Amino acid sequence: WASSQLTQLFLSTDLESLEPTCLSKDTIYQWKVVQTFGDRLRLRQRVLATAIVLLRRYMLKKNEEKGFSLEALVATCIYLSCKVEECPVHIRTICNEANDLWSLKVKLSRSNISEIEFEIISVLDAFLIVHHPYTSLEQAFHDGIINQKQLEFAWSIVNDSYASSLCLMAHPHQLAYAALLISCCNDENTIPKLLDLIKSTDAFKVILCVQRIISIYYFEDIEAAAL
Numbered sequence: 001w002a003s004s005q006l007t008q009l010f011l012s013t014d015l016e017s018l019e020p021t022c023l024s025k026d027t028i029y030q031w032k033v034v035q036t037f038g039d040r041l042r043l044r045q046r047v048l049a050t051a052i053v054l055l056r057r058y059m060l061k062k063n064e065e066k067g068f069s070l071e072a073l074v075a076t077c078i079y080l081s082c083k084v085e086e087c088p089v090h091i092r093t094i095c096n097e098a099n100d101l102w103s104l105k106v107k108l109s110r111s112n113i114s115e116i117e118f119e120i121i122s123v124l125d126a127f128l129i130v131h132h133p134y135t136s137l138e139q140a141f142h143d144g145i146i147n148q149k150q151l152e153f154a155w156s157i158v159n160d161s162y163a164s165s166l167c168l169m170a171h172p173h174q175l176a177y178a179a180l181l182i183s184c185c186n187d188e189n190t191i192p193k194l195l196d197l198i199k200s201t202d203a204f205k206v207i208l209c210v211q212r213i214i215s216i217y218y219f220e221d222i223e224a225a226a227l
Helices: 025-040 045-061 070-084 091-099 110-123 134-142 148-161 172-183 190-197 200-217
Strands: none
Touching (some): 025 045, 025 070, 025 091, 045 070, 070 091, 070 110, 134 148, 148 200, 172 190
16 A cells, blocks of 8 residues: 555666666567577577576677677577587577578578677677576585575576576676575575675675566566456
């Protein structure tokens, strides 16, 4: 009654003229596109993650639309991510599945993705490594901090987090902690332990993450309720 504004509390509140357009219908879409083309070449979640992040970074840096199809980009970001993450997928294999999955007004060829590849690398100044919150997660599990169930839930959140572009606003460990906290939020023993890992320097970001994560599921949970 007093404040359904908590709904608005899930929006920039300062328009798009200040600090990033994270977790938009496009963000959510793009992540999905990467997942699609990825599940085709039966690629692992780690490669998708790296690929969506390289794309996110590219978009941000990119300042002059070069008329590249989001599909072409996604295709190249997958190709590049496979080369980097040591799960190479021959240039050819990608062009095929790309076309055999996409009815593109411009068929993808060797030169096609190659120009894009350079376009990305060039713009990203060869900065292709991407760190993910997965390491943190497995670690907390390894050190016996979180049980197996918690891990899996938190791990899922992280996978889902890749439709929000939080990867451009928070360090992998911060996002990881948020996911972990959201997860073991009910276990009274786990929490204290998790709070230890979190240093005040992270505090805000972690909270920042938790917010975006929640909004993610309630911008995907309200869409279904409206239907």
